[PDB]
């Protein structure tokens, strides 16, 4: 039987294309890749162009034929038109800065208010204060993004990154803090900036010297799919051209290594850190900027033996530097180094918590050390004495979710942004005291037409295949019955010590309301939810544990009558695309709809493209014979089930035509192979393409809504759901 939506657009095959891999078990294994031509970028291949255009047109026709697509876009537009803001961030110009969106602006704007006048911002009258920077003015389409910013210590200068209009490359710009954007400036330019333009940057790590004369940054050779190579550290002096910038570090022997510098808050010490993979291990060196001219002739001293640990600067006290480090402490700890006694090594200030991952450490009110711990898949705030490390107790103990803390060592107050599945964003002020402090509600995000009291988030524990107890969040309307009829949207990642925290998404709650559905977040292995050991149990030869955890979550939801066996939708992005494609291959019968965002799918070829080589610490090295065998077992691109005795779920793949973070070739080849293997469906396999590269880290509000309307209408069609 031939479905009315077919046939699929044709995709050229290369029947001769193969690579031979060393294998511990088999000696050698020859892997055919009939779609290897789709590894050539869109801009360089007419074949890749023809594939993208035909697949894009085919997907759009199917998605747009569904009237629920426009119904979802209208519902999303109306509900997403709510005011959003960050916590107040104190800066060296004596102003608080905050992110603001009226509702449907493409990008967040940056506003400011004099410290002491903050009670006049974020009222019914509007954001108040003064507009500082409006990213919406940068591009005609609103796809140009602020990638970061750092104010000069003097408070006169503001260094900031803007993503270039084709790519995930950026330029660093500088403007005076006396040159804000004006509300009536025209789109397509950046008015009021200084002449400085730092090109060839792929990540924003900028550190000003204490004299405010310049900043350190990391850059690459000029850009005229290939692995990212030859990261260099430079120093830029304000008012000079980039051509005058002084080279601080290059390592031509190790072109895949990523390098950056961080300065202590005093600006006295510079920490050089190199990374050779995605693991939390560095090659680290410290220099005293008072001993050295900026250049390649600086007196670098070894902080510790290379590749054993990561070191993040938390503060300084003369020659004493405070570090958050995992040195002999996989869950991280706080330790001090005396730059005057390097050979004495690191002294523990806050011991590793064996049962809690330390996320951050920051100094406040001169000598209060604030620790954010991850315990039971949510944030805890602990206060410690900076001098002794002695515990001073807990704050916000009653709030279960995630926190963003803003405030400096010199401020007695912090602003804390609290959020969860059910809390869109409450900014609390906390004022430090002698024995206890005082907490005040500053401002709360409210969403018109959403009643947060209509929803709940349950915490359950389920056994995985191997008997391991896994935590899962289940968000649902309180009035949805547990009678085994509800649809599920189940989101997972599983990797890189990244926790799936309670996180606010209006879209997800609208999915729950409109489809009487549950939103399930199983805290599967690979994440840091139960400490670094939770990551170690879900990587390399144990990556299969991640898929088993996710499958067992679905089986538990069905068995305990949370969900209909026929209405499971799964969702994942990047490393989460390994999860969605692997689970679809290994248990196609569990799932009715699979959403993959910028998926990693070819687990043999991933090292050959942009930043993929760094993922070898997580997945293994496919060119190592031992690693090949365990990677090849699950590599979703190489394990599409034979068509004869499998019905594939409906599958929708989101990707840009250009993406540095995950090369779109992963999606291109897997979509080609799925369509070839299952040419008659019965369930469609579609690729939803953005041609504007709408950056992950810089996506306009309107693009996000269109993508969500495509995703939800496709899930609705695929699982036979009616919008309520
Ligand atoms: Na823009």
Residue numbers in the entry: 2 to 225, 231 to 730
Please share excerpts from the published article on this structure.
OphP is an essential enzyme for the biosynthesis of the macrocyclic peptide natural product omphalotin A. The enzyme has been proposed to proteolytically release a peptide intermediate from the precursor protein OphMA and to macrocyclize the multiply α-N-methylated core of this intermediate to produce omphalotin A. Our *in vitro* experiments demonstrate that OphP does not process OphMA but shows robust macrocyclase activity on pre-processed α-N-methylated peptides. OphP tolerates sequence promiscuity in the substrate but has a preference for highly α-N-methylated substrates and for N-methylated glycine residue at the catalytic site. The promiscuity of OphP is explained by structural analysis of co-complexes which reveals a predominantly hydrophobic substrate binding cleft with few interactions between substrate side chains and OphP. Similar to other POPs, the monomer has two domains, an α/β hydrolase domain (residues 1–82, 453–738) and the seven-bladed β-propeller domain (residues 83–452) ([Fig fig4]).
We first determined the structure of the putatively catalytically inactive OphP variant S580A. The eight monomers differ only in flexible loops some of which are involved in crystal contacts. All the monomers in the asymmetric unit adopt a “closed” conformation with the two domains packed against each other. Structure alignment between OphP and GmPOPB confirmed the putative catalytic triad with some deviations regarding the position of its histidine residue ([Fig fig4]). His701 of OphP sits in a flexible loop region (Leu697–Thr707) which is only resolved in two chains (chain A and chain H) where it adopts different conformations (**Figure S11**). Although chain A and H have different arrangements of this loop, in both His701 is around 15 Å away from Ser580 and a structural re-arrangement is required to form the canonical catalytic triad. Apo S580A crystallized in a closed conformation in the absence of ligand ([Fig fig4]).
